[PDB]
C-alpha cells in the first residue's frame, strides 16, 4: 500500500446486507474510513461524516469499514442496534468479517481514512479524523 498506487480491492457485506466492492466505485473518488465502535475519536468523528454525506453533488462516495467481533468490536447482531442508538445513519458500514481489508490497508491506528482518486489510486491518507473541509479540498486536488 502506498500513495499513488492502486487501492487494494475488496468485496464485503454492508450492515444492510448488500455486497459492496471497491470496484463498484470505478470512476468515483472514495472516502474510505476504517474505524471501531470502541474507539472514542472514531465515534466522535461520525456526526461530522454524516454532515459530509448529506452534501449534494459530491464527486466522491463515502464508505466505512469495521471488523465485527474482532479485537473487541461488537458482534454482527449487536453493532447495528448500537449504531442506530447513537443516531448514526446515512453512512455505509462494511463488515470486514475476516479482517483482511484492515490487513490489506495496513491499518495501524483508528480512525484512518484513505482518500482514493477516480482512477482507484490512493490519493491521500490521514491518521486520525480529517475535517470535512480538508477532505473536500483533498478530493479537489486529486484526479
Ligand atoms: C479496547 N479494546 C481492547 C478492544 C480495543 C484495543 O484492542 P488491542 O488488543 O489493545 O489492540 C488491537 C486492535 C487493533 C485491531 C483493529 C481492527 C482489526 C484488528 C486489530
Residue numbers in the entry: 43 to 185
Paper text:
In addition, the molecular interplay of the surface-exposed TlpA (renamed Etrx1) with its extracellular paralogue Etrx2 on oxidative stress resistance and virulence are unknown. This study discovers the unique molecular architecture of two surface-exposed thioredoxin-systems, Etrx1 and Etrx2 and their redox partners CcdA1, CcdA2 and SpMsrAB2 as important pneumococcal extracellular reducing systems essential for pneumococcal pathogenesis and oxidative stress resistance. The bioinformatic analysis of pneumococcal genomes identified two genes encoding surface-exposed thioredoxin-like lipoproteins, renamed here Etrx1 and Etrx2. According to the accepted catalytic mechanism of thioredoxin-like proteins, Etrx1/Etrx2 would bind their redox partner SpMsrAB2 by means of a hydrophobic surface and subsequently perform a nucleophilic attack on the target disulphide bond via the N-terminal nucleophilic thiolate of the CXXC motif (Cys84 in Etrx1, Cys81 in Etrx2). Surface-exposed Etrx1 and Etrx2 deliver electrons to the SpMsrAB2 protein for the reduction of MsrA2 (by Etrx1 or Etrx2) and MsrB2 (by Etrx2) domains.
The three-dimensional structure of Etrx2 in complex with Cyclofos-3™ comprises the sequence from Ile43 to Asn185. Four molecules were found in the asymmetric unit presenting a similar structure (rmsd value of 0.184 Å for all Cα atoms). The main differences between Etrx1 and Etrx2 structures are the presence of eight extra residues forming a coil at the C-terminus of Etrx2, the conformation of β4–α3 loop, the disposition of α3 helix and the more extended conformation of the β7 strand in Etrx2. The ligand, found in the four monomers of the asymmetric unit, is stabilized in a pocket formed by the β4–α3 loop, the α4 helix, the α4–β3 loop and the CXXC region. Cyclofos-3™ is stabilized by an H-bond with Gln113, by cation–π interaction of the polar face of the detergent with Trp80 and by pi–pi stacking interaction between phenyl ring of the detergent and Phe144. In the structure of the oxidized forms of Etrx2, a detergent molecule (Cyclofos-3™) or a HED molecule is bound to this hydrophobic pocket, very likely mimicking the redox partner interaction.
